[PDB]
Design a protein around this motif. Structure first.
Motif, PDB file in Angstrom:
ATOM      1  N   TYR A   1       0.877  -1.171   0.000  1.00  0.00           N
ATOM      2  CA  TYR A   1       0.000   0.000   0.000  1.00  0.00           C
ATOM      3  C   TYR A   1       0.915   1.222   0.000  1.00  0.00           C
ATOM      4  O   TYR A   1       1.666   1.405   0.956  1.00  0.00           O
ATOM      5  CB  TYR A   1      -0.878   0.040   1.292  1.00  0.00           C
ATOM      6  N   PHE A   2       0.867   2.032  -1.072  1.00  0.00           N
ATOM      7  CA  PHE A   2       1.652   3.290  -1.052  1.00  0.00           C
ATOM      8  C   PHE A   2       0.780   4.389  -0.436  1.00  0.00           C
ATOM      9  O   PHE A   2      -0.408   4.416  -0.677  1.00  0.00           O
ATOM     10  CB  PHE A   2       2.130   3.678  -2.454  1.00  0.00           C
ATOM     11  N   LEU A   3       1.440   5.343   0.267  1.00  0.00           N
ATOM     12  CA  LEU A   3       0.821   6.548   0.764  1.00  0.00           C
ATOM     13  C   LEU A   3       1.599   7.829   0.295  1.00  0.00           C
ATOM     14  O   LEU A   3       2.762   7.983   0.652  1.00  0.00           O
ATOM     15  CB  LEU A   3       0.812   6.545   2.294  1.00  0.00           C
ATOM     16  N   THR A   4       0.943   8.664  -0.513  1.00  0.00           N
ATOM     17  CA  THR A   4       1.575   9.792  -1.152  1.00  0.00           C
ATOM     18  C   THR A   4       1.937  10.920  -0.151  1.00  0.00           C
ATOM     19  O   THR A   4       2.969  11.563  -0.339  1.00  0.00           O
ATOM     20  CB  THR A   4       0.776  10.342  -2.350  1.00  0.00           C
ATOM     21  N   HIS A   5       1.052  11.146   0.814  1.00  0.00           N
ATOM     22  CA  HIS A   5       1.164  12.196   1.817  1.00  0.00           C
ATOM     23  C   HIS A   5       0.248  12.052   3.001  1.00  0.00           C
ATOM     24  O   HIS A   5      -0.811  11.459   2.845  1.00  0.00           O
ATOM     25  CB  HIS A   5       0.993  13.598   1.172  1.00  0.00           C
ATOM     26  N   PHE A   6       0.596  12.738   4.100  1.00  0.00           N
ATOM     27  CA  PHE A   6      -0.221  12.728   5.354  1.00  0.00           C
ATOM     28  C   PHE A   6      -1.356  13.763   5.427  1.00  0.00           C
ATOM     29  O   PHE A   6      -1.376  14.705   6.314  1.00  0.00           O
ATOM     30  CB  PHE A   6       0.741  12.853   6.549  1.00  0.00           C
TER      31      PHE A   6
ATOM     32  N   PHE B   1      -2.911  -1.638  11.718  1.00  0.00           N
ATOM     33  CA  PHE B   1      -2.570  -1.978  10.338  1.00  0.00           C
ATOM     34  C   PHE B   1      -1.398  -2.926  10.293  1.00  0.00           C
ATOM     35  O   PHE B   1      -0.342  -2.640  10.862  1.00  0.00           O
ATOM     36  CB  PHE B   1      -2.233  -0.695   9.542  1.00  0.00           C
ATOM     37  N   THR B   2      -1.556  -4.060   9.582  1.00  0.00           N
ATOM     38  CA  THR B   2      -0.454  -5.059   9.478  1.00  0.00           C
ATOM     39  C   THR B   2       0.069  -5.396   8.057  1.00  0.00           C
ATOM     40  O   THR B   2       0.631  -6.489   7.839  1.00  0.00           O
ATOM     41  CB  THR B   2      -0.882  -6.367  10.183  1.00  0.00           C
ATOM     42  N   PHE B   3      -0.084  -4.467   7.106  1.00  0.00           N
ATOM     43  CA  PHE B   3       0.514  -4.624   5.785  1.00  0.00           C
ATOM     44  C   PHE B   3       1.597  -3.582   5.534  1.00  0.00           C
ATOM     45  O   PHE B   3       1.630  -2.552   6.207  1.00  0.00           O
ATOM     46  CB  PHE B   3      -0.527  -4.532   4.732  1.00  0.00           C
ATOM     47  N   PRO B   4       2.513  -3.870   4.609  1.00  0.00           N
ATOM     48  CA  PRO B   4       3.598  -2.916   4.396  1.00  0.00           C
ATOM     49  C   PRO B   4       3.041  -1.599   3.760  1.00  0.00           C
ATOM     50  O   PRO B   4       2.065  -1.637   2.959  1.00  0.00           O
ATOM     51  CB  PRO B   4       4.598  -3.664   3.496  1.00  0.00           C
ATOM     52  N   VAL B   5       3.587  -0.492   4.260  1.00  0.00           N
ATOM     53  CA  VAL B   5       3.209   0.862   3.812  1.00  0.00           C
ATOM     54  C   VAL B   5       4.467   1.489   3.292  1.00  0.00           C
ATOM     55  O   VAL B   5       5.490   1.412   3.944  1.00  0.00           O
ATOM     56  CB  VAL B   5       2.639   1.707   4.925  1.00  0.00           C
ATOM     57  N   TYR B   6       4.428   1.989   2.049  1.00  0.00           N
ATOM     58  CA  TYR B   6       5.597   2.567   1.438  1.00  0.00           C
ATOM     59  C   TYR B   6       5.301   4.090   1.301  1.00  0.00           C
ATOM     60  O   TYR B   6       4.179   4.427   0.920  1.00  0.00           O
ATOM     61  CB  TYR B   6       5.851   1.975   0.052  1.00  0.00           C
ATOM     62  N   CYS B   7       6.288   4.906   1.652  1.00  0.00           N
ATOM     63  CA  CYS B   7       6.111   6.398   1.777  1.00  0.00           C
ATOM     64  C   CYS B   7       7.427   7.142   1.931  1.00  0.00           C
ATOM     65  O   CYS B   7       8.491   6.538   1.993  1.00  0.00           O
ATOM     66  CB  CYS B   7       5.216   6.672   2.952  1.00  0.00           C
ATOM     67  N   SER B   8       7.402   8.498   2.017  1.00  0.00           N
ATOM     68  CA  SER B   8       8.592   9.248   2.274  1.00  0.00           C
ATOM     69  C   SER B   8       9.018   9.129   3.772  1.00  0.00           C
ATOM     70  O   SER B   8       8.208   8.731   4.632  1.00  0.00           O
ATOM     71  CB  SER B   8       8.407  10.720   1.960  1.00  0.00           C
ATOM     72  N   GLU B   9      10.248   9.522   4.060  1.00  0.00           N
ATOM     73  CA  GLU B   9      10.735   9.588   5.465  1.00  0.00           C
ATOM     74  C   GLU B   9       9.788  10.427   6.366  1.00  0.00           C
ATOM     75  O   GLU B   9       9.429  10.019   7.502  1.00  0.00           O
ATOM     76  CB  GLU B   9      12.148  10.178   5.495  1.00  0.00           C
ATOM     77  N   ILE B  10       9.432  11.623   5.888  1.00  0.00           N
ATOM     78  CA  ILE B  10       8.519  12.477   6.645  1.00  0.00           C
ATOM     79  C   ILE B  10       7.142  11.855   6.928  1.00  0.00           C
ATOM     80  O   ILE B  10       6.614  11.948   8.092  1.00  0.00           O
ATOM     81  CB  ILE B  10       8.438  13.904   6.051  1.00  0.00           C
TER      82      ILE B  10
ATOM     83  N   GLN C   1       2.801   0.620  13.799  1.00  0.00           N
ATOM     84  CA  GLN C   1       4.028   0.034  14.316  1.00  0.00           C
ATOM     85  C   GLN C   1       5.084   0.052  13.292  1.00  0.00           C
ATOM     86  O   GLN C   1       4.831  -0.259  12.113  1.00  0.00           O
ATOM     87  CB  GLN C   1       3.882  -1.451  14.680  1.00  0.00           C
ATOM     88  N   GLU C   2       6.286   0.274  13.779  1.00  0.00           N
ATOM     89  CA  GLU C   2       7.459   0.528  13.000  1.00  0.00           C
ATOM     90  C   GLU C   2       7.787  -0.532  11.950  1.00  0.00           C
ATOM     91  O   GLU C   2       8.211  -0.220  10.829  1.00  0.00           O
ATOM     92  CB  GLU C   2       8.613   0.634  13.980  1.00  0.00           C
ATOM     93  N   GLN C   3       7.631  -1.794  12.323  1.00  0.00           N
ATOM     94  CA  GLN C   3       7.915  -2.926  11.410  1.00  0.00           C
ATOM     95  C   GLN C   3       7.134  -2.908  10.060  1.00  0.00           C
ATOM     96  O   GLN C   3       7.531  -3.575   9.105  1.00  0.00           O
ATOM     97  CB  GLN C   3       7.645  -4.279  12.148  1.00  0.00           C
ATOM     98  N   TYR C   4       6.017  -2.190  10.011  1.00  0.00           N
ATOM     99  CA  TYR C   4       5.183  -2.049   8.801  1.00  0.00           C
ATOM    100  C   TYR C   4       5.453  -0.758   7.975  1.00  0.00           C
ATOM    101  O   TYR C   4       4.918  -0.611   6.886  1.00  0.00           O
ATOM    102  CB  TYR C   4       3.715  -2.061   9.202  1.00  0.00           C
ATOM    103  N   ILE C   5       6.252   0.164   8.516  1.00  0.00           N
ATOM    104  CA  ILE C   5       6.551   1.426   7.835  1.00  0.00           C
ATOM    105  C   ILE C   5       7.833   1.295   7.019  1.00  0.00           C
ATOM    106  O   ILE C   5       8.943   1.078   7.587  1.00  0.00           O
ATOM    107  CB  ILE C   5       6.681   2.593   8.859  1.00  0.00           C
ATOM    108  N   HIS C   6       7.702   1.431   5.690  1.00  0.00           N
ATOM    109  CA  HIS C   6       8.872   1.396   4.803  1.00  0.00           C
ATOM    110  C   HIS C   6       9.175   2.748   4.123  1.00  0.00           C
ATOM    111  O   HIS C   6       8.660   3.031   3.038  1.00  0.00           O
ATOM    112  CB  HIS C   6       8.671   0.340   3.733  1.00  0.00           C
ATOM    113  N   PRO C   7      10.022   3.569   4.745  1.00  0.00           N
ATOM    114  CA  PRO C   7      10.302   4.873   4.176  1.00  0.00           C
ATOM    115  C   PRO C   7      11.276   4.688   3.003  1.00  0.00           C
ATOM    116  O   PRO C   7      12.140   3.796   3.070  1.00  0.00           O
ATOM    117  CB  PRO C   7      10.983   5.631   5.349  1.00  0.00           C
ATOM    118  N   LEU C   8      11.125   5.454   1.922  1.00  0.00           N
ATOM    119  CA  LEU C   8      12.103   5.493   0.836  1.00  0.00           C
ATOM    120  C   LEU C   8      12.687   6.903   0.648  1.00  0.00           C
ATOM    121  O   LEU C   8      11.923   7.902   0.797  1.00  0.00           O
ATOM    122  CB  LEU C   8      11.450   5.021  -0.484  1.00  0.00           C
TER     123      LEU C   8
END
Ligand code: NI
Length: 341
Positions: A29-34, A46-55, A67-74
């Protein structure tokens, strides 16, 4: 159910699709912005990987308690591999941490999803310049020629000059700036800077701003309302009752409020120049609506698309009515015919 314009064909990917439960056949699941219409659905369970910016990553962790384990910052402007597909995140010139995403499909198709953006000629020299884009998923918020607004620089100039003038005439005047989401931080930081003050705000807002990687932020903001002559308040409270009440709270430290409501567009823009804008006044309170936009104007949008020359355009905003859809498709055809692609 998840609409087609949030699904990326040829992948297990969705964009900004967190309020439909488990989407059938989505591996990332990508997230463009907050912003809340875009993250709606995310929470600490939420228990699936989330891909997003560092911010965006800092905000998910600290504000929503994902939870941190699901947050994938690029990192931005970097070729990355996610579940076997090359992607790049690019700055969207929206709010802090907002990105566009380039997807390089296994079959050779290249897709650009803009998220929310404000189109700029500087984008014409990112990794976008290097190859052809077949499909464009486009932020069409202001896709109609009546939507003109000034540059962000001209608006900030107007606010800085206005605030500085009022406070120099009356050192007992307070400046208040409304907010309801991240974005538009320049308004209140630029005003505080010309006045040599810190911006005062609630603890929840202070926390939010500490996630944003703004350089020297500790020097610019505070939770001590009394020491500061620029206050932030919820946008809802920017009205004569809400402002009178707030003035009561300051304990006769101030005798005049000057307030700013950053709005997107407001039909006063068809007739009036930024130099010409006037406040709404009652007694010792004045409220200025200023057209500080973090979305493309109609002309900015048109120029970006005519430069990119996509093969297919898919709108992500104003898609709910047939009349809107048909209006937008008309402009896309004009653009394409005018430019020759
Ligand atoms: Ni947004």
């Amino acid at each position: 159910t998840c609409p087609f314009y949030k699904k990326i064909p040829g992948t297990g990917f969705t964009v900004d699709a967190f309020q439909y439960g488990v989407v059938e056949g989505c591996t990332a699941y990508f997230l463009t912005h907050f912003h809340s219409d875009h993250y709606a659905g995310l929470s600490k369970h939420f228990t699936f990987p989330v891909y997003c910016s560092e911010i965006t990553g800092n905000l998910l962790k600290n504000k929503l308690h994902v939870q941190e384990q699901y947050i994938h910052p690029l990192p931005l402007d970097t070729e990355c591999i996610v579940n076997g597909v090359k992607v790049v995140l690019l700055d969207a010139n929206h709010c802090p941490g907002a990105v566009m995403i380039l997807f390089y499909l296994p079959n050779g198709t290249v897709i650009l999803h803009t998220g929310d953006f404000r189109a700029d000629p500087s984008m014409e020299r990112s990794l976008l310049a290097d190859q052809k884009v077949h499909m464009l998923y486009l932020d069409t918020t202001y896709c109609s020629p009546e939507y003109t607004f000034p540059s962000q620089q001209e608006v900030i100039r107007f606010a800085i000059n206005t605030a500085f003038e009022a406070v120099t005439l009356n050192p007992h005047a307070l400046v208040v700036c409304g907010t309801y989401s991240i974005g538009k931080e320049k308004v209140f930081l630029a005003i505080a800077d010309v006045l040599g003050s810190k911006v005062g705000m609630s603890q929840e807002k202070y926390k939010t701003l500490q996630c944003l990687n703004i350089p020297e932020i500790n020097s610019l903001i505070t939770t001590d309302m009394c020491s500061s002559l620029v206050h932030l308040l919820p946008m809802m409270q920017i009205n004569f009752k809400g402002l009178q009440s707030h003035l009561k709270k300051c304990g006769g430290k101030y005798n005049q409020i000057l307030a700013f409501r950053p709005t997107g567009w407001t039909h006063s823009n068809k007739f009036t120049r930024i130099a010409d804008v006037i406040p709404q006044t009652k007694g010792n309170i004045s409220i200025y609506g200023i057209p500080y936009s973090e979305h493309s104007s109609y002309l900015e949008m048109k120029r970006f698309v005519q430069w990119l020359k996509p093969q297919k355009i898919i709108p992500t905003v104003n898609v709910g009515t047939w009349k809107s859809r048909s209006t937008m498709e008309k402009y896309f055809r004009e653009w394409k015919l005018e430019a020759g692609y």
